[PDB]
């Protein structure tokens with residue numbers, strides 16, 4: 082009758098997950114009441130504290146653990162293998178793995194067990210994947226029009242446009258009126274690393290691309306990456322960068338965006354930042370000084386290995402597996418992922434077409450897509466296959482639009498035939514990689530920021546590459562190359 086789940090949700094959503102409409106209806110459908118431990122900030126740290134202290138729930142919902150965490154928990158018996166539960170009790174999930182058997186292999190550890198239940202979302206394939214570019218660049222076209230400027234075609238054009246934004250006062254002469262160039266530095270949708278590809282090769286959140294010769298390339302020791310840093314340094318020197326770029330957060334970024342203070346900025350979807358208007362548009366791919374014109378592929382995809390694990394203290398495995406399988410029912414997967422219908426107290430993502438028993442996206446009418454989604458989605462394990470569109474659900478309007486923009490602006494310049502596959506490394510290789518990344522990851526962004534602020538990259542570049550080798554870069558690369566070769570060979 083009752084299960085205790087830890088979960089992760091947005092701070093815009095209710096403290097008690099059971100106040101969400103989806104979870105009220107789901108309790109009626111399943112007959113199971115969930116008592117939630119709901120962490121709405123710093124989920125991973127609070128989860129790790131619970132595991133370390135022995136305060137385990139029946140299952141961790143919407144978990145998102147790394148592979149190294151996954152295998153360590155499995156080795157210590159914190160979580161259990163689940164392939165037998167799938168086989169015995171999970172017909173919805175088994176049907177998905179029968180329609181797309183490639184996912185079975187992505188769920189299976191090198192020891193042959195399955196330890197977690199995945200998120201699956203089919204939106205485009207290959208270069209056309211919705212994930213191929215995360216930190217899209219957007220520009221204020223109203224300012225271009227007001228100042229009599231053409232859309233930049235080159236990185237040199239971009240400098241001149243941004244200087245016009247600073248010197249030409251398109252939205253007022255105040256010291257803080259116009260922010261020519263802004264970003265949230267680091268990983269994710271708001272970083273500036275998209276532009277590094279205008280110097281060839283570019284960069285992504287893994288700092289890892291795959292050459293057309295089949296050689297895995299760590300991007301952050303490339304001469305091309307040095308030239309990218311120097312370009313951003315020029316913008317800094319010219320007084321063109323948001324003075325709080327390296328300190329602000331998403332809520333501040335969004336507040337500045339809503340006031341339309343940005344000339345050029347980065348985000349997944351402009352509608353979350355500068356709003357639903359034609360004042361901002363996609364910045365087309367720029368040519369660099371030598372004619373480099375490129376879009377680096379991310380290694381993102383519509384799959385996450387672990388959106389749920391079952392702990393060793395769960396005493397109702399059949400009930401838990403059946404609850405989880407209910408999330409993989411198509412109409413439930415769509416709603417858990419995106420929101421729901423029929424709330425009279427709150428805007429709805431969907432309406433339910435009674436006749437066809439299917440879901441149809443409603444217009445957002447100016448509401449930010451991520452804001453309403455955060456309030457009403459559930460997350461957790463689920464599956465959305467491209468066969469569902471036109472049958473179970475409409476394709477989201479924002480998703481279709483973004484797929485069209487990727488195809489129009491970016492795919493022609495995505496010249497790497499491959500990106501880096503989603504591999505499942507052995508526990509030994511995972512722990513070697515995790516020790517190297519404990520040094521490398523923070524160091525890479527620290528130096529990048531330092532160089533943008535101090536201008537000393539030419540003096541320090543060689544020492545920096547030596548430091549990366551001290552931290553184990555060549556071993557790191559050899560391991561990534563091993564698993565790439567093993568993936569291509571197919572074990």
Ligand SMILES: OC[C@@H]1O[C@H](O[C@]2(CO[C@]3(CO[C@]4(CO[C@]5(CO)O[C@H](CO)[C@@H](O)[C@@H]5O)O[C@H](CO)[C@@H](O)[C@@H]4O)O[C@H](CO)[C@@H](O)[C@@H]3O)O[C@H](CO)[C@H](O)[C@H]2O)[C@H](O)[C@H](O)[C@@H]1O
Nearest residue numbers: 202211269270349350353450451454455460477479480483
């Ligand atoms: O790092 C914390 C962790 O991140 C994990 O997921 C998120 C993103 O979750 C969402 C994603 O929502 C979108 C992208 O959604 C898709 C692609 O999957 O893109 C289509 C629209 O173009 C849409 O149909 C597809 O589903 O991202 C933007 C906002 O960035 C949304 O407008 C869009 O829907 O982010 C939303 C807000 O957090 C959440 O409601 C969504 O589920 O990864 C990034 C971080 O790199 C997000 O911060 C994070 O949410 C993980 O799911 C977890 O929940 C934590 O967010």
Ligand SMILES: [Ca+2]
Nearest residue numbers: 247248250254
């Ligand atoms: Ca000015």
Ligand SMILES: [Ca+2]
Nearest residue numbers: 298299300303
């Ligand atoms: Ca390299």
